[PDB]
Design an enzyme around this catalytic site. Structure first.
Site, PDB file in Angstrom:
ATOM      1  CG  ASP A 136      -2.214   1.058   1.035  1.00 55.31           C
ATOM      2  OD1 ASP A 136      -2.394   1.214  -0.043  1.00 55.31           O
ATOM      3  OD2 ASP A 136      -2.868   1.290   1.927  1.00 55.31           O
ATOM      4  CE  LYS A 138      -3.044   4.744   0.181  1.00 53.90           C
ATOM      5  NZ  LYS A 138      -4.220   4.895  -0.066  1.00 53.90           N
ATOM      6  CG  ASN A 141      -0.496   4.624   3.503  1.00 51.70           C
ATOM      7  OD1 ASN A 141      -1.167   5.125   4.079  1.00 51.70           O
ATOM      8  ND2 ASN A 141      -0.808   3.660   2.649  1.00 51.70           N
ATOM      9  CG  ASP A 158      -2.198   2.194   5.824  1.00 56.22           C
ATOM     10  OD1 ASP A 158      -2.426   0.862   6.396  1.00 56.22           O
ATOM     11  OD2 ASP A 158      -2.981   2.565   5.279  1.00 56.22           O
ATOM     12  CB  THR A 177      -4.511   3.289  -3.802  1.00 52.83           C
ATOM     13  OG1 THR A 177      -5.029   3.266  -2.354  1.00 52.83           O
ATOM     14  CG2 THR A 177      -5.167   4.597  -4.581  1.00 52.83           C
TER      15      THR A 177
HETATM   16  O1  LIG Z   1      -1.290   4.789  10.283  1.00 50.63           O
HETATM   17  C1  LIG Z   1      -2.023   5.457  10.301  1.00 50.63           C
HETATM   18  C2  LIG Z   1      -1.746   6.994  10.604  1.00 50.63           C
HETATM   19  C3  LIG Z   1      -0.589   7.496  11.262  1.00 50.63           C
HETATM   20  C4  LIG Z   1       0.050   6.599  12.059  1.00 50.63           C
HETATM   21  C5  LIG Z   1       1.037   7.060  12.847  1.00 50.63           C
HETATM   22  C6  LIG Z   1       1.425   8.131  12.995  1.00 50.63           C
HETATM   23  O2  LIG Z   1       2.196   8.689  13.987  1.00 50.63           O
HETATM   24  C7  LIG Z   1       0.730   9.248  12.238  1.00 50.63           C
HETATM   25  C8  LIG Z   1      -0.363   8.780  11.424  1.00 50.63           C
HETATM   26  C9  LIG Z   1      -2.646   8.050  10.183  1.00 50.63           C
HETATM   27  O3  LIG Z   1      -3.904   7.673   9.549  1.00 50.63           O
HETATM   28  C10 LIG Z   1      -4.004   6.507   9.007  1.00 50.63           C
HETATM   29  C11 LIG Z   1      -5.267   6.029   8.398  1.00 50.63           C
HETATM   30  C12 LIG Z   1      -5.580   4.991   8.024  1.00 50.63           C
HETATM   31  O4  LIG Z   1      -6.771   4.562   7.548  1.00 50.63           O
HETATM   32  C13 LIG Z   1      -4.819   4.049   8.146  1.00 50.63           C
HETATM   33  C14 LIG Z   1      -3.573   4.185   9.088  1.00 50.63           C
HETATM   34  O5  LIG Z   1      -2.530   3.222   9.208  1.00 50.63           O
HETATM   35  C15 LIG Z   1      -3.178   5.442   9.318  1.00 50.63           C
HETATM   36 BR   LIG Z   2       0.196   2.815  11.069  1.00 44.11          BR
HETATM   37 BR   LIG Z   3      -0.512   0.293  10.924  1.00 45.24          BR
END
Ligand SMILES: O=c1c(-c2ccc(O)cc2)coc2cc(O)cc(O)c12
Ligand SMILES: [Br-]
Ligand SMILES: [Br-]
Ligand SMILES: [Br-]
Ligand SMILES: [Br-]
Length: 274
Positions: A136, A138, A141, A158, A177
């Site tokens: 995933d 992109k 992420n 992610d 995506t």
């Molecule tokens: O991991 C994230 C983060 C994420 C994780 C850790 C951070 O320090 C900051 C953002 C933000 O939005 C998401 C939104 C999602 O749909 C899935 C995800 O894994 C994430």
């Molecule tokens: Br994450």
């Molecule tokens: Br994650």
């Protein structure tokens, strides 16, 4: 595998929201015992065996198992996991400088692009060395540590589609995506570490030009474009981009996964190699 079932709010205070997706929401939080700050990702569990809503326990356990393996400056790390009847809650490393996607919305130079890309390559080298396909990749992420420096540092986030590739390829229900998925994903073929390399080619194209190489007017158009390798380097966008940069992209946006550059190839490529 089971997780900590005490109320997370007994140990953490949550604050501003960092991200929101189909089955997950992420909030800044602060651990009461240490004052240290984290990102809490609340993942909605499935309520029944056959439901399409929520994330299956199998899928959550896979993501957590992969996250527990990871310790590298360019990849998110996992601190703790809690759960209750409704959610699994991942206490993740906090990365506060926002998405690469939103940073880009603010065209880079080739140096700025390679400064990001080298970090992404380093992170993916680590992951692929552990036989982890991210699936995933992109700009959404990729998170920046601090967006207010000339050369922001990044971490890959992610792992919701991530899989271990123990046999060189996986054959499961896996589809990310459309703008970023490789032809083998579009065509429902066995998938390996190679799919990530295609996604990196797409990211690189976007970093340099501000444009998406396969994007059509509908998701089906985009997918059809991906499968046919229907992209080209528009002169208006790439006229002052080096031919060596285009070469790097060209060797990643290759339909046959066996002929695509590997992560090791990408680090030795003359555009990247120090
Ligand atoms: O991991 C994230 C983060 C994420 C994780 C850790 C951070 O320090 C900051 C953002 C933000 O939005 C998401 C939104 C999602 O749909 C899935 C995800 O894994 C994430
Ligand atoms: Br994450
Ligand atoms: Br994650
Ligand atoms: Br906050
Ligand atoms: Br490797």
């Amino acid at each position: 595998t089971v997780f900590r079932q005490e109320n997370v709010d007994d140990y953490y205070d949550t604050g501003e929201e960092l991200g929101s997706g189909q089955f997950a929401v992420v909030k800044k939080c602060r651990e009461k015992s240490t004052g240290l700050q984290y990102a809490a990702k609340f993942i909605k569990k499935r309520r029944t065996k056959s439901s399409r809503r929520g994330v299956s326990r199998e899928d959550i356990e896979r993501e957590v198992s992969i996250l527990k393996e990871i310790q590298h400056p360019n990849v998110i790390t996992l601190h703790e996991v809690y759960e209750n009847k409704t959610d699994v809650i991942l206490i993740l490393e906090l990365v506060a400088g926002g998405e690469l996607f939103d940073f880009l919305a603010e065209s880079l130079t080739e140096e700025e692009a390679t400064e990001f890309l080298k970090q992404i390559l380093n992170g993916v080298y680590y992951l692929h060395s552990l036989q982890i396909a991210h699936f995933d990749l992109k700009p959404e992420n990729i998170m920046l540590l601090d967006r207010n420096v000339p050369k922001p540092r990044i971490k890959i986030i992610d792992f919701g589609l991530a899989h271990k590739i123990d046999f060189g390829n996986e054959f499961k229900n896996i589809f990310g995506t459309p703008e970023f998925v490789a032809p083998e994903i579009v065509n429902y073929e066995p998938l390996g570490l190679e799919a990530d390399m295609w996604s990196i080619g797409v990211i690189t194209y976007i970093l340099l030009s501000g444009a998406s190489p396969f994007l059509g007017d509908t998701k089906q158009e985009t997918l059809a474009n991906v499968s046919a390798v229907n992209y080209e380097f528009e002169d208006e966008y790439f006229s002052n981009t080096s031919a060596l940069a285009k070469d790097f992209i060209r060797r990643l946006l290759v339909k046959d996964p066996k002929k695509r550059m590997t992560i090791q190839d990408s680090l030795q490529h003359p555009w990247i190699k120090p």
